[PDB]
């Protein structure tokens, strides 16, 4: 019974830790998505300036 309690406690902590890690990776994935949007927008604006200048 004592060993079962110990193992259950460690497994519960492991579940909590993996939940925290999954939330953290969600946050960082969202941040990378935002920065990818930033690069898309800046490249699009540079292309717009290029086409405006080449087309007067």
Sign of CA dihedral 52, 53, 54, 55: positive
Q: Of a second copy, another protein, none, which one does residue 41 interact with (CB within 5 to 8 Å by kind)?
A: none
Q: Is 3 in the site for another protein (CB under 8 A)?
A: no
Identify which of residues 18 and 55 has a Cβ nearer to a second copy in the complex: 18
44 binds a second copy (CB under 8 A): no
Q: Please report where in the chains the tokens 């920065």 appear, as a residue.
A: 35
Is residue 4 close enough to count as binding another protein by CB under 8 A? no
Output the CA torsion sign for 23, 26, 30, 35.
Answer: positive
């Amino acid at each position: 019974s004592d060993k079962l309690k110990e193992a259950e406690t460690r497994a519960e902590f492991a579940e909590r830790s993996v939940t925290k890690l999954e939330k953290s990776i969600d946050d960082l994935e969202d941040e990378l998505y935002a920065q990818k949007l930033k690069y898309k927008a800046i490249s699009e604006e540079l292309d717009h300036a290029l086409n405006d200048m080449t087309s007067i």
